[PDB]
Design a protein around this motif. Sequence first.
Motif: not given
Length: 50
Positions: A1-14, A31-35
């Motif tokens: 899921n692209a909306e979840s908190s883990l997605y935005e937590s890991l996507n903000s990593f450098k 859509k899941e594979l797109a995420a």
Amino acid sequence: NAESSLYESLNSFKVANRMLITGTPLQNNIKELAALVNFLMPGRFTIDQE
DNA sequence: CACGTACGCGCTGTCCCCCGCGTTTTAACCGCCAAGGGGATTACTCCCTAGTCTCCAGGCACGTGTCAGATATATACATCC
């Protein structure tokens, strides 16, 4: 899921290089594979038509 | 204002139950599906019904005369000293 908190937590990593290890890449729809492919490398791959 | 006595208050005992603390459990909380229905908007269409107007008539309010039940006397029969 692209909306979840883990997605935005890991996507903000450098991190230069990422890798996803799973057994089922697609479970419900494309859509899941797109995420997953947006989390891998953000932008040259787009999915907009179901 | 006078009297008097009952009760508010102070003191003491006592016991009991709530508080403080340590330990163990446990469920609240946060993050997750999985699909589906409820509901808030935007736009549109239609039609029923309530506002508005005119006209009229009877319900409500007031006033008044009467009328049947309740109250207070007028006179006659029965009765005590």
